[PDB]
Structures are given as structure tokens and as C-alpha cells.
Amino acid sequence: QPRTFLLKYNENGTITDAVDCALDPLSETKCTLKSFTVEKGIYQTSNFR
Amino acid sequence: NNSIAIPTNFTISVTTEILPVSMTKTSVDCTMYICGDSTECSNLLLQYG
């Protein structure tokens, strides 16, 4: 399905990890922040409609 | 240089300062404001970075 992912490329240009930005709120925070690392806390990530 | 004014009376008074600390925590979603659910707009909106 044509969903948004956060892709992380290594030195070779191969994707070694990805976040399905439509999977769960936590994944959404990672796609918002463009990091596979989040800090302890609360983020505003989207406004739903 | 030879006369000094010395208090004979005083008042212990209380004054009030009104000093703002914080404001209302607003948020406006930019996409919503501009395009809402408008598809073409939402896509074009990207081209503005």
C-alpha cells in the first residue's frame, strides 16, 4: 500500500531500517522527528481530521 | 553642606505589579488552514518546501 515510510540508508545506499509512519503513534513520532530515536516525553506530531 | 533632612515619619506600604509569565498555548495546523482536504493543493503545498 502506498504509505509513508521513513527510510534510513547506510553508506552503500541500502535501506537498513524503515518506519511505517501509519503503523502506531510511536512510529509517527519517529517519522515526524526523522529519527529512529525519540526522547522520553510527549510530542505533537500531526492534527487528525 | 550643613543641613540634612532626617525622616520623622515613614509609611510601610505595599504596591502591586502585574507582570505576565505565560500566554495561551495555541496551535494552528498550516495544512488545514491552507488546503484542508484539497488534494491538489496539499501536493502543490510541498513544492514550497
Coordinates of all heavy atoms in Angstrom, one line a residue:
Chain A
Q1 N 0.9 -1.1 0.0 CA 0.0 0.0 0.0 C 1.0 1.2 0.0 O 2.1 1.2 0.5 CB -0.9 0.0 1.2 CG -1.8 -1.2 1.3 CD -2.9 -1.1 2.4 OE1 -2.5 -0.9 3.6 NE2 -4.1 -1.3 2.1
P2 N 0.6 2.3 -0.7 CA 1.3 3.5 -0.9 C 1.3 4.4 0.3 O 0.5 5.3 0.3 CB 0.6 4.1 -2.0 CG -0.8 3.8 -1.9 CD -0.8 2.3 -1.3
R3 N 2.0 4.0 1.4 CA 2.1 4.6 2.6 C 3.5 5.2 2.8 O 4.4 4.8 2.1 CB 1.8 3.5 3.7 CG 0.5 2.9 3.7 CD 0.3 1.9 4.8 NE -1.0 1.2 4.7 CZ -2.1 1.8 5.3 NH1 -2.1 2.9 5.9 NH2 -3.3 1.1 5.2
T4 N 3.6 6.2 3.7 CA 4.8 6.9 4.0 C 5.6 6.2 5.0 O 5.1 5.6 6.0 CB 4.5 8.3 4.5 OG1 3.7 9.0 3.6 CG2 5.8 9.0 4.7
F5 N 6.9 6.1 4.7 CA 8.0 5.4 5.4 C 9.1 6.4 5.6 O 9.3 7.2 4.7 CB 8.5 4.2 4.7 CG 7.5 3.0 4.8 CD1 6.4 2.9 4.0 CD2 7.8 1.9 5.7 CE1 5.5 1.9 4.1 CE2 6.9 0.9 5.8 CZ 5.8 0.8 5.0
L6 N 9.7 6.3 6.8 CA 11.0 6.9 7.0 C 12.0 5.9 6.7 O 12.0 4.8 7.2 CB 11.1 7.3 8.4 CG 12.5 8.0 8.8 CD1 12.6 9.3 8.1 CD2 12.6 8.2 10.3
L7 N 12.9 6.3 5.7 CA 13.9 5.3 5.2 C 15.2 5.8 5.7 O 15.5 7.0 5.7 CB 13.9 5.2 3.6 CG 12.6 5.0 3.0 CD1 12.8 4.9 1.5 CD2 11.9 3.7 3.5
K8 N 16.1 4.8 6.2 CA 17.4 5.2 6.5 C 18.4 4.4 5.7 O 18.3 3.1 5.7 CB 17.6 4.9 8.0 CG 19.0 5.3 8.5 CD 19.2 5.1 10.0 CE 20.6 5.4 10.5 NZ 20.7 5.2 12.0
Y9 N 19.2 5.1 5.0 CA 20.2 4.5 4.1 C 21.5 4.5 4.8 O 21.8 5.4 5.6 CB 20.3 5.3 2.8 CG 19.0 5.4 2.0 CD1 18.1 6.5 2.3 CD2 18.6 4.5 1.1 CE1 16.9 6.6 1.6 CE2 17.4 4.6 0.4 CZ 16.6 5.6 0.7 OH 15.4 5.8 0.0
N10 N 22.3 3.5 4.6 CA 23.6 3.2 5.1 C 24.5 3.8 4.0 O 24.0 4.6 3.2 CB 23.8 1.7 5.3 CG 23.7 1.0 4.0 OD1 23.8 1.6 2.9 ND2 23.7 -0.3 4.0
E11 N 25.9 3.6 4.2 CA 26.9 4.0 3.3 C 26.8 3.5 1.8 O 27.1 4.2 0.9 CB 28.3 3.7 3.8 CG 28.7 4.4 5.1 CD 30.0 4.0 5.6 OE1 30.4 2.9 5.4 OE2 30.6 4.8 6.3
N12 N 26.3 2.3 1.7 CA 26.2 1.6 0.4 C 25.1 2.2 -0.4 O 25.3 2.2 -1.6 CB 26.0 0.1 0.5 CG 27.3 -0.6 0.9 OD1 28.4 -0.1 0.7 ND2 27.1 -1.7 1.6
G13 N 24.0 2.6 0.2 CA 22.8 3.2 -0.3 C 21.6 2.1 -0.2 O 20.5 2.2 -0.8
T14 N 21.8 1.1 0.7 CA 20.8 0.1 1.0 C 20.0 0.6 2.3 O 20.5 1.2 3.2 CB 21.5 -1.2 1.3 OG1 22.2 -1.6 0.1 CG2 20.5 -2.3 1.6
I15 N 18.7 0.4 2.2 CA 17.9 0.7 3.3 C 18.1 -0.3 4.3 O 18.0 -1.5 4.1 CB 16.4 0.7 2.9 CG1 16.2 1.8 1.8 CG2 15.5 1.1 4.1 CD1 14.8 1.7 1.1
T16 N 18.4 0.1 5.6 CA 18.7 -0.9 6.6 C 17.7 -0.9 7.7 O 17.7 -1.9 8.5 CB 20.1 -0.7 7.3 OG1 20.2 0.6 7.9 CG2 21.2 -0.8 6.2
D17 N 16.8 0.0 7.6 CA 15.7 0.1 8.5 C 14.7 1.0 8.0 O 15.0 1.9 7.1 CB 16.2 0.6 9.9 CG 15.2 0.3 11.0 OD1 14.2 -0.3 10.8 OD2 15.6 0.5 12.2
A18 N 13.5 1.0 8.5 CA 12.4 1.9 8.0 C 11.3 1.9 9.1 O 11.1 1.0 9.8 CB 11.9 1.4 6.6
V19 N 10.5 3.1 9.1 CA 9.5 3.3 10.0 C 8.2 3.4 9.2 O 8.2 4.3 8.4 CB 9.7 4.5 10.9 CG1 8.5 4.7 11.8 CG2 10.9 4.4 11.7
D20 N 7.2 2.6 9.4 CA 5.9 2.7 8.8 C 5.1 3.7 9.6 O 4.8 3.6 10.8 CB 5.1 1.4 8.7 CG 3.8 1.5 8.0 OD1 3.2 2.6 8.1 OD2 3.3 0.5 7.5
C21 N 5.0 4.9 8.9 CA 4.6 6.2 9.6 C 3.0 6.2 9.7 O 2.4 7.1 10.2 CB 4.8 7.5 8.7 SG 6.5 7.7 8.1
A22 N 2.4 5.0 9.4 CA 1.0 4.9 9.5 C 0.8 3.7 10.4 O -0.3 3.1 10.5 CB 0.3 4.7 8.1
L23 N 1.8 3.1 11.0 CA 1.7 2.0 11.9 C 1.1 2.3 13.2 O 0.0 1.8 13.4 CB 3.0 1.3 12.0 CG 3.0 0.1 13.0 CD1 2.1 -1.0 12.5 CD2 4.4 -0.5 13.2
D24 N 1.7 3.1 14.2 CA 1.3 3.3 15.5 C 1.8 4.7 15.9 O 2.7 5.1 15.2 CB 1.8 2.2 16.5 CG 3.3 2.1 16.5 OD1 3.9 3.1 16.1 OD2 3.9 1.2 17.0
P25 N 1.2 5.4 16.9 CA 1.7 6.7 17.2 C 3.1 6.8 17.5 O 3.6 7.9 17.2 CB 0.9 7.0 18.5 CG -0.4 6.2 18.4 CD 0.0 5.0 17.7
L26 N 3.8 5.8 18.0 CA 5.2 5.9 18.3 C 6.1 6.0 17.0 O 6.9 6.9 17.0 CB 5.7 4.6 19.0 CG 7.2 4.5 19.3 CD1 7.6 5.7 20.2 CD2 7.4 3.2 20.0
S27 N 5.7 5.2 16.0 CA 6.2 5.2 14.6 C 6.0 6.6 14.0 O 6.9 7.2 13.3 CB 5.6 4.2 13.7 OG 5.9 2.9 14.2
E28 N 4.9 7.2 14.2 CA 4.5 8.5 13.7 C 5.4 9.6 14.3 O 5.8 10.4 13.5 CB 3.1 8.9 14.1 CG 2.6 10.2 13.5 CD 1.1 10.4 13.8 OE1 0.3 9.5 13.5 OE2 0.8 11.5 14.2
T29 N 5.8 9.5 15.6 CA 6.7 10.4 16.3 C 8.1 10.3 15.6 O 8.6 11.4 15.3 CB 6.9 10.1 17.8 OG1 5.7 10.3 18.4 CG2 8.0 11.0 18.4
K30 N 8.6 9.1 15.3 CA 9.9 8.8 14.6 C 9.9 9.4 13.2 O 10.9 10.1 12.8 CB 10.2 7.3 14.6 CG 10.5 6.7 15.9 CD 10.8 5.2 15.8 CE 11.1 4.6 17.2 NZ 11.4 3.2 17.1
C31 N 8.8 9.3 12.3 CA 8.7 9.9 11.1 C 8.6 11.4 11.2 O 9.1 12.1 10.3 CB 7.5 9.3 10.3 SG 7.7 7.6 9.8
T32 N 8.0 12.0 12.3 CA 7.9 13.4 12.5 C 9.2 14.0 12.8 O 9.6 15.0 12.2 CB 6.9 13.8 13.6 OG1 5.6 13.3 13.3 CG2 6.9 15.3 13.8
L33 N 10.0 13.3 13.7 CA 11.3 13.8 14.1 C 12.4 13.4 13.1 O 13.5 14.0 13.3 CB 11.5 13.3 15.5 CG 10.5 13.7 16.6 CD1 10.9 13.1 17.9 CD2 10.5 15.2 16.7
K34 N 12.2 12.5 12.1 CA 13.2 12.0 11.2 C 14.4 11.4 12.0 O 15.5 11.5 11.7 CB 13.7 13.2 10.4 CG 12.5 13.9 9.7 CD 11.9 13.0 8.6 CE 10.8 13.8 7.9 NZ 9.7 14.3 8.8
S35 N 14.1 10.5 13.0 CA 14.9 9.8 13.8 C 14.2 8.6 14.3 O 13.0 8.4 14.3 CB 15.3 10.7 15.0 OG 16.1 10.0 15.9
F36 N 15.0 7.5 14.5 CA 14.6 6.3 14.9 C 14.8 6.3 16.4 O 14.4 5.4 17.2 CB 15.5 5.2 14.2 CG 15.2 5.0 12.8 CD1 15.4 6.0 11.9 CD2 14.6 3.8 12.3 CE1 15.2 5.9 10.5 CE2 14.3 3.7 11.0 CZ 14.6 4.7 10.1
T37 N 15.2 7.5 17.0 CA 15.4 7.7 18.4 C 14.6 8.8 18.7 O 14.7 9.9 18.1 CB 16.9 8.0 18.7 OG1 17.7 6.9 18.3 CG2 17.1 8.3 20.2
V38 N 13.8 8.7 19.9 CA 13.0 9.7 20.5 C 13.5 9.8 21.9 O 14.0 8.9 22.5 CB 11.5 9.2 20.4 CG1 11.1 9.0 19.0 CG2 11.3 8.0 21.2
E39 N 13.1 11.0 22.5 CA 13.4 11.1 23.9 C 12.2 10.9 24.7 O 11.1 10.9 24.0 CB 14.0 12.5 24.2 CG 15.3 12.8 23.5 CD 15.9 14.2 23.8 OE1 15.3 14.9 24.6 OE2 16.9 14.5 23.3
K40 N 12.3 10.6 26.0 CA 11.2 10.5 26.9 C 10.5 11.7 27.0 O 11.0 12.8 27.2 CB 11.8 10.1 28.3 CG 10.7 9.8 29.4 CD 11.3 9.4 30.7 CE 11.9 10.5 31.4 NZ 12.3 10.2 32.8
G41 N 9.1 11.7 26.7 CA 8.4 12.9 26.8 C 7.1 12.7 25.9 O 6.6 11.7 25.7
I42 N 6.6 13.9 25.5 CA 5.4 13.9 24.7 C 5.7 14.8 23.5 O 6.4 15.8 23.8 CB 4.1 14.4 25.5 CG1 2.9 14.3 24.7 CG2 4.4 15.9 25.9 CD1 1.6 14.5 25.5
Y43 N 5.3 14.4 22.3 CA 5.5 15.2 21.1 C 4.1 15.5 20.5 O 3.1 14.7 20.7 CB 6.4 14.6 20.1 CG 7.8 14.3 20.6 CD1 8.1 13.2 21.3 CD2 8.8 15.3 20.4 CE1 9.4 12.9 21.8 CE2 10.1 15.0 20.8 CZ 10.4 13.9 21.5 OH 11.6 13.7 22.0
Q44 N 3.9 16.6 19.8 CA 2.8 16.9 18.9 C 3.3 16.4 17.5 O 4.4 16.9 17.2 CB 2.5 18.4 18.8 CG 1.3 18.8 17.9 CD 0.8 20.2 18.1 OE1 0.4 20.5 19.2 NE2 0.9 21.0 17.0
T45 N 2.6 15.6 16.8 CA 3.1 15.0 15.6 C 2.3 15.3 14.4 O 2.9 15.5 13.3 CB 3.3 13.5 15.8 OG1 2.1 12.9 16.1 CG2 4.3 13.2 17.0
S46 N 1.0 15.4 14.5 CA 0.0 15.6 13.5 C -1.2 16.2 14.1 O -1.3 16.3 15.4 CB -0.3 14.3 12.8 OG -1.0 13.4 13.6
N47 N -2.3 16.6 13.3 CA -3.6 17.1 13.8 C -4.4 16.2 12.9 O -4.3 16.4 11.7 CB -3.9 18.6 13.6 CG -3.1 19.4 14.5 OD1 -3.4 19.7 15.7 ND2 -2.0 19.9 14.0
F48 N -5.3 15.4 13.5 CA -6.0 14.5 12.7 C -7.3 15.1 12.1 O -7.8 16.0 12.8 CB -6.4 13.2 13.5 CG -7.4 13.5 14.6 CD1 -8.8 13.4 14.3 CD2 -7.0 13.8 15.9 CE1 -9.7 13.6 15.3 CE2 -8.0 14.0 16.9 CZ -9.3 13.9 16.6
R49 N -7.9 14.5 11.0 CA -9.1 15.0 10.5 C -9.8 13.8 9.9 O -9.1 13.1 9.2 CB -8.9 16.1 9.5 CG -10.2 16.7 8.9 CD -10.0 17.9 8.1 NE -11.2 18.3 7.3 CZ -12.1 19.2 7.8 NH1 -11.9 19.8 8.9 NH2 -13.2 19.5 7.0
Chain B
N1 N 25.8 72.5 52.5 CA 26.7 71.5 53.1 C 26.5 71.5 54.6 O 27.4 71.0 55.4 CB 28.1 71.7 52.7 CG 28.3 71.5 51.2 OD1 27.8 70.6 50.6 ND2 29.1 72.4 50.6
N2 N 25.5 72.1 55.3 CA 25.5 72.0 56.7 C 24.1 71.6 57.3 O 23.9 71.7 58.5 CB 26.0 73.3 57.2 CG 25.2 74.5 56.8 OD1 24.1 74.3 56.3 ND2 25.7 75.6 57.1
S3 N 23.2 71.2 56.5 CA 21.7 70.9 56.8 C 21.3 69.6 56.2 O 21.7 69.3 55.0 CB 20.8 72.0 56.3 OG 19.5 71.6 56.5
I4 N 20.7 68.7 56.9 CA 20.4 67.3 56.5 C 18.9 67.2 56.8 O 18.5 67.7 57.8 CB 21.3 66.3 57.2 CG1 21.0 64.9 56.6 CG2 21.0 66.3 58.7 CD1 22.0 63.8 56.9
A5 N 18.2 66.5 55.9 CA 16.8 66.2 56.2 C 16.7 64.9 56.8 O 17.2 63.9 56.3 CB 16.0 66.2 54.8
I6 N 16.1 64.7 58.1 CA 16.1 63.4 58.6 C 14.7 62.9 58.8 O 13.9 63.8 59.3 CB 16.8 63.4 60.0 CG1 18.3 63.8 59.8 CG2 16.7 62.0 60.7 CD1 19.0 64.0 61.2
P7 N 14.2 61.7 58.4 CA 12.8 61.2 58.5 C 12.4 61.4 60.0 O 13.1 61.0 60.9 CB 12.9 59.8 58.0 CG 14.0 59.7 57.1 CD 15.1 60.6 57.8
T8 N 11.1 61.9 60.2 CA 10.4 61.9 61.4 C 9.2 60.9 61.4 O 8.6 60.6 62.5 CB 9.9 63.3 61.7 OG1 9.1 63.8 60.7 CG2 11.1 64.2 61.8
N9 N 8.9 60.5 60.1 CA 7.9 59.5 59.9 C 8.1 58.8 58.6 O 8.7 59.3 57.7 CB 6.5 60.1 60.0 CG 5.4 59.1 60.4 OD1 5.7 58.0 60.6 ND2 4.2 59.6 60.5
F10 N 7.5 57.6 58.6 CA 7.5 56.7 57.4 C 6.3 56.0 57.3 O 5.5 55.9 58.2 CB 8.7 55.7 57.6 CG 8.6 54.8 58.7 CD1 8.0 53.6 58.6 CD2 9.1 55.2 60.0 CE1 7.9 52.7 59.7 CE2 9.0 54.4 61.1 CZ 8.4 53.1 61.0
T11 N 6.1 55.4 56.0 CA 4.9 54.5 55.8 C 5.5 53.2 55.2 O 6.5 53.2 54.4 CB 3.9 55.2 54.8 OG1 3.4 56.4 55.4 CG2 2.7 54.3 54.6
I12 N 4.9 52.1 55.7 CA 5.2 50.8 55.2 C 4.0 50.5 54.3 O 2.9 50.1 54.8 CB 5.3 49.7 56.3 CG1 6.4 50.1 57.3 CG2 5.7 48.4 55.7 CD1 7.7 50.4 56.7
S13 N 4.3 50.5 53.0 CA 3.3 50.4 52.1 C 3.6 49.2 51.2 O 4.6 48.7 51.1 CB 3.2 51.7 51.3 OG 4.4 51.9 50.5
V14 N 2.5 48.8 50.5 CA 2.5 47.6 49.6 C 2.0 48.2 48.3 O 1.0 48.9 48.3 CB 1.6 46.5 50.1 CG1 1.8 45.2 49.3 CG2 1.9 46.2 51.6
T15 N 2.7 47.8 47.2 CA 2.4 48.2 45.9 C 2.2 46.9 45.1 O 2.7 45.9 45.6 CB 3.4 49.1 45.1 OG1 4.7 48.4 45.1 CG2 3.6 50.4 45.9
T16 N 1.5 47.0 44.0 CA 1.2 45.9 43.2 C 1.8 46.1 41.8 O 1.7 47.1 41.1 CB -0.3 45.7 43.1 OG1 -0.9 45.5 44.4 CG2 -0.7 44.5 42.2
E17 N 2.4 44.9 41.3 CA 3.0 44.8 39.9 C 2.3 43.7 39.3 O 2.2 42.6 39.9 CB 4.5 44.5 40.0 CG 5.1 44.3 38.6 CD 6.6 44.1 38.7 OE1 7.1 44.0 39.8 OE2 7.2 43.9 37.7
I18 N 1.8 43.9 38.1 CA 1.1 42.9 37.2 C 2.1 42.6 36.1 O 2.5 43.5 35.3 CB -0.2 43.5 36.6 CG1 -1.1 44.1 37.7 CG2 -0.9 42.4 35.8 CD1 -1.4 43.1 38.8
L19 N 2.7 41.4 36.2 CA 3.8 41.0 35.3 C 3.6 39.7 34.6 O 3.7 38.8 35.4 CB 5.1 40.9 36.2 CG 6.4 40.6 35.4 CD1 6.6 41.7 34.4 CD2 7.5 40.4 36.4
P20 N 3.1 39.7 33.3 CA 2.9 38.5 32.6 C 4.0 37.4 32.6 O 5.2 37.7 32.6 CB 2.6 39.0 31.2 CG 2.1 40.4 31.4 CD 2.9 40.9 32.6
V21 N 3.6 36.1 32.6 CA 4.5 35.0 32.7 C 4.3 34.2 31.5 O 5.3 33.7 31.0 CB 4.3 34.1 34.0 CG1 5.1 32.9 33.9 CG2 4.6 34.9 35.2
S22 N 3.1 34.0 31.1 CA 2.8 32.9 30.1 C 1.7 33.5 29.2 O 1.1 34.5 29.5 CB 2.4 31.6 30.8 OG 1.1 31.8 31.4
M23 N 1.5 32.7 28.1 CA 0.3 33.0 27.2 C -0.3 31.8 26.9 O 0.2 30.7 27.2 CB 0.6 33.8 26.0 CG 1.5 33.1 25.0 SD 1.8 34.0 23.5 CE 0.2 33.9 22.7
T24 N -1.5 31.9 26.3 CA -2.3 30.8 25.8 C -1.6 29.9 24.8 O -1.0 30.4 23.8 CB -3.6 31.4 25.1 OG1 -4.3 32.2 26.1 CG2 -4.5 30.3 24.6
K25 N -1.6 28.6 24.9 CA -0.8 27.7 24.1 C -1.6 27.3 22.9 O -2.3 26.3 22.8 CB -0.5 26.4 25.0 CG 0.5 26.6 26.1 CD 0.6 25.4 27.0 CE 1.1 24.2 26.2 NZ 1.2 23.0 27.1
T26 N -1.6 28.2 21.9 CA -2.2 27.9 20.6 C -1.5 27.1 19.7 O -0.3 27.0 19.7 CB -2.6 29.2 19.9 OG1 -1.4 29.9 19.5 CG2 -3.4 30.1 20.8
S27 N -2.2 26.5 18.7 CA -1.6 25.8 17.5 C -2.7 25.9 16.5 O -3.9 25.8 16.7 CB -1.3 24.4 17.9 OG -0.7 23.8 16.8
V28 N -2.1 26.1 15.3 CA -2.8 26.2 14.0 C -2.0 25.2 13.2 O -0.8 25.2 13.4 CB -2.7 27.6 13.4 CG1 -3.4 27.6 12.0 CG2 -3.4 28.6 14.3
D29 N -2.8 24.3 12.5 CA -2.2 23.4 11.6 C -2.2 24.2 10.2 O -3.2 24.5 9.6 CB -3.0 22.1 11.5 CG -2.4 21.1 10.6 OD1 -2.6 21.2 9.4 OD2 -1.6 20.3 11.1
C30 N -1.1 24.5 9.7 CA -0.8 25.1 8.4 C -1.5 24.4 7.3 O -2.0 25.0 6.5 CB 0.8 25.2 8.1 SG 1.3 26.0 6.6
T31 N -1.4 23.1 7.2 CA -2.1 22.4 6.1 C -3.5 22.6 6.0 O -4.1 23.0 5.0 CB -1.8 20.9 6.1 OG1 -0.4 20.7 6.0 CG2 -2.5 20.2 4.9
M32 N -4.2 22.5 7.2 CA -5.6 22.7 7.4 C -6.1 24.1 7.1 O -7.2 24.3 6.6 CB -5.9 22.4 8.8 CG -5.9 20.9 9.2 SD -6.4 20.6 10.9 CE -6.2 18.8 10.9
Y33 N -5.3 25.1 7.5 CA -5.6 26.5 7.3 C -5.6 26.7 5.8 O -6.5 27.4 5.3 CB -4.5 27.4 7.9 CG -4.7 28.9 7.7 CD1 -5.7 29.5 8.4 CD2 -3.9 29.5 6.8 CE1 -5.9 30.9 8.2 CE2 -4.1 30.9 6.6 CZ -5.1 31.6 7.3 OH -5.3 32.9 7.1
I34 N -4.6 26.2 5.0 CA -4.4 26.5 3.6 C -5.3 25.7 2.7 O -5.9 26.2 1.8 CB -2.9 26.3 3.2 CG1 -2.1 27.3 4.0 CG2 -2.8 26.5 1.7 CD1 -0.6 27.0 3.8
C35 N -5.1 24.3 2.8 CA -5.7 23.4 1.8 C -6.8 22.6 2.4 O -7.7 22.1 1.6 CB -4.6 22.4 1.4 SG -3.1 23.0 0.6
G36 N -6.8 22.3 3.7 CA -7.8 21.4 4.2 C -7.6 20.0 3.6 O -6.6 19.4 3.8
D37 N -8.7 19.5 3.0 CA -8.6 18.1 2.4 C -8.3 18.2 0.9 O -8.4 17.2 0.2 CB -9.8 17.3 2.7 CG -10.1 17.1 4.2 OD1 -9.1 16.8 4.9 OD2 -11.2 17.3 4.6
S38 N -8.1 19.5 0.4 CA -7.8 19.8 -1.0 C -6.5 19.0 -1.4 O -5.4 19.4 -1.0 CB -7.7 21.2 -1.3 OG -7.3 21.5 -2.6
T39 N -6.6 18.0 -2.3 CA -5.6 17.1 -2.8 C -4.5 17.8 -3.5 O -3.3 17.7 -3.3 CB -6.1 16.0 -3.7 OG1 -7.1 15.2 -2.9 CG2 -5.0 15.0 -4.1
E40 N -4.9 18.5 -4.6 CA -4.0 19.2 -5.5 C -3.3 20.2 -4.7 O -2.0 20.4 -5.0 CB -4.8 19.9 -6.6 CG -5.3 18.9 -7.7 CD -6.1 19.6 -8.8 OE1 -6.3 20.8 -8.7 OE2 -6.4 19.0 -9.7
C41 N -3.9 21.0 -3.9 CA -3.3 22.0 -3.0 C -2.3 21.4 -2.1 O -1.1 21.9 -2.1 CB -4.4 22.7 -2.2 SG -3.7 24.0 -1.1
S42 N -2.7 20.3 -1.4 CA -1.8 19.6 -0.5 C -0.5 19.1 -1.2 O 0.6 19.2 -0.6 CB -2.5 18.4 0.2 OG -3.6 18.9 1.0
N43 N -0.6 18.6 -2.3 CA 0.5 18.3 -3.1 C 1.4 19.5 -3.5 O 2.6 19.5 -3.4 CB 0.1 17.4 -4.3 CG -0.4 16.0 -3.9 OD1 -0.1 15.6 -2.8 ND2 -1.2 15.4 -4.7
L44 N 0.7 20.5 -4.0 CA 1.5 21.7 -4.5 C 2.1 22.4 -3.4 O 3.2 23.0 -3.7 CB 0.5 22.7 -5.2 CG 0.0 22.2 -6.6 CD1 -1.1 23.2 -7.0 CD2 1.1 22.3 -7.6
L45 N 1.5 22.4 -2.2 CA 1.9 23.0 -1.0 C 3.4 22.5 -0.6 O 4.1 23.3 0.0 CB 1.0 22.6 0.1 CG 1.2 23.2 1.5 CD1 1.1 24.7 1.4 CD2 0.2 22.6 2.5
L46 N 3.8 21.3 -1.1 CA 5.1 20.6 -0.9 C 6.2 21.3 -1.6 O 7.4 21.1 -1.2 CB 5.0 19.2 -1.3 CG 4.0 18.3 -0.4 CD1 4.0 16.9 -1.1 CD2 4.6 18.2 1.0
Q47 N 5.9 21.9 -2.7 CA 6.7 22.5 -3.7 C 7.2 23.8 -3.3 O 8.1 24.4 -3.9 CB 6.0 22.6 -5.1 CG 5.6 21.3 -5.7 CD 5.0 21.5 -7.1 OE1 4.5 22.6 -7.4 NE2 5.0 20.5 -7.9
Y48 N 6.7 24.2 -2.1 CA 7.1 25.4 -1.4 C 7.9 25.1 -0.2 O 8.3 25.9 0.5 CB 5.8 26.2 -0.9 CG 4.9 26.7 -2.1 CD1 4.0 25.9 -2.6 CD2 5.1 28.0 -2.5 CE1 3.2 26.3 -3.7 CE2 4.3 28.5 -3.6 CZ 3.4 27.6 -4.1 OH 2.6 28.1 -5.2
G49 N 8.3 23.8 -0.1 CA 9.2 23.2 0.9 C 8.6 23.2 2.2 O 7.4 22.9 2.4

